[PDB]
Amino acid sequence: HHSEMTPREIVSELDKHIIGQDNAKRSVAIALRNRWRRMQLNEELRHEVTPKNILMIGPTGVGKTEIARRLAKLANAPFIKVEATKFTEVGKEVDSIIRDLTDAAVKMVRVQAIEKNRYRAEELAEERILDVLIPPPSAARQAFRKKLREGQLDDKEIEIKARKLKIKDAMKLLIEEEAAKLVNPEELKQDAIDAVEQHGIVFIDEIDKICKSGPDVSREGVQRDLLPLVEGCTVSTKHGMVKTDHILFIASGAFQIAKPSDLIPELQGRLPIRVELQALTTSDFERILTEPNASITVQYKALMATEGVNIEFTDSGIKRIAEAAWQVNESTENIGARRLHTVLERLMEEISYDASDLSGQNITIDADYVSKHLDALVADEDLSRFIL
Amino acid sequence: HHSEMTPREIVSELDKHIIGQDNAKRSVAIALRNRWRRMQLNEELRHEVTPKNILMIGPTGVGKTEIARRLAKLANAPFIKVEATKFTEVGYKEVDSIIRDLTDAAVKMVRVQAIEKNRYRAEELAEERILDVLIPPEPSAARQAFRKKLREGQLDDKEIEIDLAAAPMGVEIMAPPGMEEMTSQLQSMFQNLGGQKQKARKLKIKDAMKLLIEEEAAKLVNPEELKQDAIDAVEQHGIVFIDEIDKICKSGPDVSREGVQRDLLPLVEGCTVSTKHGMVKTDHILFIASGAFQIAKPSDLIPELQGRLPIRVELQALTTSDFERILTEPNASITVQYKALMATEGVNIEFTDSGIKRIAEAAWQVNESTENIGARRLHTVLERLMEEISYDASDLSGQNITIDADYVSKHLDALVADEDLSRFIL
Amino acid sequence: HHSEMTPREIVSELDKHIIGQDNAKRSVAIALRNRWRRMQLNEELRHEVTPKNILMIGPTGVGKTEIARRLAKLANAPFIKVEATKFTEVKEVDSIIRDLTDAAVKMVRVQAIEKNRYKLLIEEEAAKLVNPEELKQDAIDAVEQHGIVFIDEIDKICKSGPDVSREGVQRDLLPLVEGCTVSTKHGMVKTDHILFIASGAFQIAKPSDLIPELQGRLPIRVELQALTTSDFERILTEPNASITVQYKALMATEGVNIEFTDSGIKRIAEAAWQVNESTENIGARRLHTVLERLMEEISYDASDLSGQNITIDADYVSKHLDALVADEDLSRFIL
Amino acid sequence: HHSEMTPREIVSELDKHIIGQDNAKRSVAIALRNRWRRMQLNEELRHEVTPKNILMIGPTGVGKTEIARRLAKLANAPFIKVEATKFTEVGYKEVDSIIRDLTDAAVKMVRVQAIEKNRYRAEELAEERILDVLIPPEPSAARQAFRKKLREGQLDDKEIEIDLAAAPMVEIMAPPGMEEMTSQLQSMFQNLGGQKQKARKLKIKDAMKLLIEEEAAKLVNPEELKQDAIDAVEQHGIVFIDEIDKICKSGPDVSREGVQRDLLPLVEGCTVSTKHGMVKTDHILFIASGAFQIAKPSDLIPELQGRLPIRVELQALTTSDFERILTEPNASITVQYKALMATEGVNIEFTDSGIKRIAEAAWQVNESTENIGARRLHTVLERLMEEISYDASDLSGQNITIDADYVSKHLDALVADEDLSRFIL
Ligand SMILES: Nc1ncnc2c1ncn2[C@@H]1O[C@H](COP(=O)(O)OP(=O)(O)O)[C@@H](O)[C@H]1O
Ligand SMILES: Nc1ncnc2c1ncn2[C@@H]1O[C@H](COP(=O)(O)OP(=O)(O)O)[C@@H](O)[C@H]1O
Ligand SMILES: Nc1ncnc2c1ncn2[C@@H]1O[C@H](COP(=O)(O)OP(=O)(O)O)[C@@H](O)[C@H]1O
């Protein structure tokens, strides 16, 4: 059901992925904790209590989206990201948010079912093999069970319409037959509805652009159409009837042009929690390259390891990589932490291409190797917009 | 099924939720009371007498919508709130959708009332079928043993194989956004025709119990009697609330603005609207409209609409004395909810009289310093005030936290004093 | 089948609801009587003879719509009212016949449920012998032969930029009056024999500003006089189930006997006449808002006033009204 | 089939309905005569020869549409009238809809022709199933006895229980564009539910007519009836496009000429899909009309001018023509008002001097304000007859004579005032 984690355990889990932005983490943790707190109340208070929506404020590239993505992934919750300006053009309907979110939940519950159906099909597949070895666990059945998993015993011929086969090729055929009987289409579609209603999470990006003569009537019309979603309503979908009352909504935006006070008063009352996010620094970039679990540099260490090349990133090399991304954002356009992705690939493109010929070597990326493939490019701002 | 409550008993019940706004409570009581007065007349007068619709006037956040919500909830009536500007575009949402979503809201209303009557019986037969798998076949011993262990025990995590019904079709249809409602109706037809059977599958008693209650409760209630009864709820008891009707009043946009009034005209004057649950007649449906009317006036409405809104009430703006009452008096007020939410973690929150008073002063000052959003400022102010407690409530378990006037001025006055920061955070 | 009533019998029944406007009652009586006259002709003349459509002219709130509603209710005919300006935006015009069919399906369905009730074995034969598709077929026969359509504010689509879009509504409405075949979910519907009644103020434009093809499809023209103070008094009392009789019976449910004096009925009408002259003239609709504001105190206290006789005089009217009617700024919001 | 009448026999028949406009009648007579002329040619010349489409020019109300209506009714051809401005919005209407409604008019036309032939076979099979209920089962005696008693006798008032078909089935919500589709889906569930007949008690009087309808559907093949209507549209189809002058030619000109480009594949010929099957528009005859006061036929796109070879100007009607329209045409408005008042028992008689002043009154209104053509005769007559039509119930058994004095009493007062003539007349 809903996870029992405390807000401190949720923020501690988010620190494995997002760097900094502790205030934003505490806001989503409190909202996720209220999901469990509402389950502990009586029947009257469960309907009266609605989720507390979060309005994030900050420049682009500070992690507003990754916090929401990891939260839904931490809460095992369906997630969708919608641009607020998509509805500005008009006839797309605003209800499409719930329609596409539901579709994401239907595929989610299917993959989670196949994951739980595989271990169940394999247990019953080898269980039917043990009936041929020892006709009816006692001893011999437990002996052939441990010898079938650990050993290469599968090469022996075993007759399992009865037909003779090899346990290696009979095991994969018995998994196909057992996995087809473990799926319930009715309970799968109903759980996808409960996933959207109870656990649903919706992230509305760049909601500041729809704030307030000609365009303002079109802008404030999106909020009036977004209003029944946050206040709760019924949306018809192909999969069934989806109620948005218990869905959590997380909005974000720059708010340089407008302010959250420019939103309609009915929407402000539906976005009670507000959190400002600080912009990232050069000291933060050095942290993002290494600290987060499966960071882009750790991934590249493992990717070249597939070819047999050991990549090592020195601190002086990581420092100039971070200094490179900061310089490009200042010289041209500030895209946030996304600059680290394009800068890392441009430096690593020569190693990634020749990695097949570098098998068996240890390549050390220092401050000098970084400045050779970068400083020439970072010096030209005209080249920095196309290449970086 | 019309409630016999007098106008004074209705206003007294509304006082349990809404604070003040006595004129608007007396308006909705008259409309609801006429529902019972009409049912006592002869056949000729029942059709000639039509509900008296209400046009509410007042600034935002004064409780216009909540009065309509509690009115329909008090009368056990289907209710829907629609924004008048939703139909300004006109290219598809249809104006008929107001009765459509009102019909579907009534079907769920009469369904939950049918589930509660069938609940204890469906749960009795659901667990009865579980006992047939545990002990294959007066109850003797083992059956009464597993029955008591199933209700009291957490043994539902065990694996049990029970036969259950399933729809073998499993077909998905691609549809453009307009056909999203229609294709779902086609999917229910193919499952209703061919498949009648039950297939043996392996489940867990925790998930198998909830799946058995749905199957047994469906057999107890008849769909033909329930679907036609919901239509009788929309025609007699239906209640519709049209928000921000002042924004559709009156060259370029005014033709599209007044077009919404023309489209809403057959609803209030009465007409026949087709729904998937049946044919619905809007003649006796009660309509309530609300608006600020700062830009326009009720005279700027089309003359055909003015006659269909005979009852007029303006609602007064809330004051600081009202904010102090809203924080406590109403049932399930925002402080009552937060008090119970922190109690989940084991923390006892207490709000002093002077603390509640300085919370209201903060919300009042923000509405004046920046933008007046009405009583909705109380949530943003309270959530900002309690965000430290709500995060630490896990570690504060077993402690009594008292919110005094000093605690309020510490976490708020700093923010309210700076107007530039007040707009972002509050 | 279809009831045969002389034009005087139609007007005499309309007098039980509408007050005055005798010129419009005589026009609608001719059209409904032609429904029975065409049934008595031969096969060749039935298709050649087309219904005579009516174009009504007059200010708002004079009873143009009530005359049409009571006419169809008297003939048990499907009725629909659509605003001509709804098609100014570039909804299809065929939706007029679609919503007319939907309203006729429920009409013949509710009327058929009563016939089946006229005890458990009789109801089991009612759910069997009655066919759901046969009711759909009976509705289509009611739309083609007896159908009545009312098009409000038709003068607003008269005639350079918007005039091409305004007159385009007339051109799209043309096949409906000339006759055509419109497809609906309930079946195929033919508009040849449907009666159409149009109305408008015609202060901005004139019927001559309509396209020439449309003028010939509206042979009957009638102007409705503006209601006066003497007419307002008659609307409060004379019509069957009048707004005052309704409010007299609603209070009677609580146990209170309400009586309206002749002096009060006169000043109630004078109050409504004063508001239409001071701010905006909404016609007889002003009586609805004025009555409710006068009776709002009695309607709320009717539970505690049970067993009492409350008499509404001219003094009680002047107490709850003259204060509000004198202030025009408040008259727009409250009245 | 294809009528063999000569151009002179066509025009002579059109004079029974339309008055004057001889140059236009000769144009439509040539186009209908070429339908028969092409039939007598060889296989190569039949396809190469295409119908000669007609463009009518003249003021409104001169009878352009009545010539097209009476022409198709004379040739027993499917006919449809469409306004050229209907497709200006082009939202969803597709121009292909002209052939769609034309096919539906042909299906109903050939269906009634199939009902008359199936009447004797259905009535034989309808009473055949009734005889199985009376005498349970060459005919021997009892079957031949009840057969002669059912046709000759009024014995149908007896209660007889016969089995008849019905379906248990549902409503579907759809946007206005799917209104035609959902009607087809509903018919498919009624056919799929089951094939059988439910037993119910009835009367032979009402059971015989209900048995004829069920048998008549089985006798006619839905593939033969549906495909025969396609042959009626391709060869005999006649389409009238009104006010084509309003789609002639910057901002509106792109949307106006866009209608001609969408109308172009219809006149040049193409394949249009209908619910009844595939229809080819190559040989369908098209007739266009317009006032052409604002624009000219040369303003049309060059590809459309080549597809409208026949050009005819229609003259404006005069006072002498209005006198003829009130009397000469079959089922004229004055004869129709004579029979309508006859239903109440009143005999109406129009004098020659009264008819003459009516025509002069209709001309004066067209001259004083706006000229709407012969349509003015409808409003002028109804205003004159409105007092008689209301009292027709109490005037039963009386003979009312409409003279020149009765015309000037109810009209000249109203016609003299031009401000009131616009509203009332
Ligand atoms: N605090 C952070 N820690 C780690 N990665 C981050 C952080 N902030 C941004 N990123 C990077 O930015 C990308 C996504 O940024 P996103 O959250 O979509 O920007 P925004 O906050 O403007 O929505 C991710 O690929 C991630 O690597
Ligand atoms: N008089 C009142 N008494 C209690 N709560 C109120 C009152 N007025 C407003 N509220 C609060 O404001 C919210 C309702 O605002 P709403 O009525 O929707 O705004 P509006 O009246 O502008 O439509 C509710 O959450 C309610 O708690
Ligand atoms: N002559 C009349 N007699 C009785 N009621 C009238 C009369 N004229 C107007 N009304 C009132 O006006 C309302 C309907 O007006 P309506 O006919 O819609 O206006 P319009 O004539 O502008 O269409 C009804 O509620 C009716 O009580």
Ligand SMILES: Nc1ncnc2c1ncn2[C@@H]1O[C@H](COP(=O)(O)OP(=O)(O)O)[C@@H](O)[C@H]1O
């Ligand atoms: N020459 C005519 N003979 C008889 N009736 C006519 C004649 N011209 C017009 N009408 C009358 O006018 C109407 C037809 O006008 P129509 O042909 O549609 O106008 P247009 O010729 O401008 O398209 C019919 O009702 C018909 O009675």
